[PDB]
Symmetry: none
């Protein structure tokens, strides 16, 4: 199984597909937009994945699938994975809320916290690529 097939308008990197969405959304609005396309807000687990994203990232900032929820007590991606790789901007993460912060990706690819009601013009989804039968 080679797994590099992505739907129309999505872009492959490794075994995932990515969608670079545009339009003004608060974090959960973006979450729902990804859900509706059978994806999820992007999870980022390596510098090579980040570099792929940075090259294609909106200049005015994008939601990604990371949040710091007080119930978890740490940053967790939408898929439940924990932060291993990080690409925080200088001085980040800086909490906005003490209970519920969302994370955005700047045009530079660097991350910062935001209130989840922040309106951003872009958002990135991911999903698994489909596989070619052997």
């Amino acid at each position: 199984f080679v797994c590099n097939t992505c739907p129309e308008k999505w872009i492959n990197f490794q075994r995932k597909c990515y969608y670079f969405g545009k339009g003004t959304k608060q974090w959960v609005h973006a979450r729902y937009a990804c859900d509706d396309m059978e994806g999820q807000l992007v999870s980022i687990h390596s510098p090579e994945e980040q570099d792929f994203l940075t090259k294609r990232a909106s200049h005015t900032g994008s939601w990604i699938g990371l949040r710091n929820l007080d119930l978890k007590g740490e940053f967790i991606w939408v898929d439940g994975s924990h932060v291993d790789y990080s690409n925080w901007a200088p001085g980040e993460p800086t909490s906005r809320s003490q209970s519920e912060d969302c994370v955005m990706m700047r045009g530079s690819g660097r991350w910062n916290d935001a209130f989840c009601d922040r309106k951003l013009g872009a958002w990135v989804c991911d999903r698994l690529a489909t596989c070619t039968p052997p």
Copy 2:
């Protein structure tokens, strides 16, 4: 027999006639509107037919004659024909309904699923052109 004759207010393409309706309608409202003009909600079976329609597609969306009834499983055109040609928008069909989904045509000509009770401002009917007897 050459078949390119259409009734008043309809437009010929190939061996069919088309009516571009305007006015706010849910899918079955549009279905009935077409029936009442002795046509049916449009079926689309080639890139050339699609191109004809795209050039005339309402910018705010139009009902077409494709529907997924859980009881056939699949999308079927109103005339009973199956999908051979498709022009789904990216990511479509994405089922709206748990049971019965209707299809609309965007201004781009690409199709998307919708709840059948969505109100759209346009709809397209077709019928067969009548034929000139051999001379």
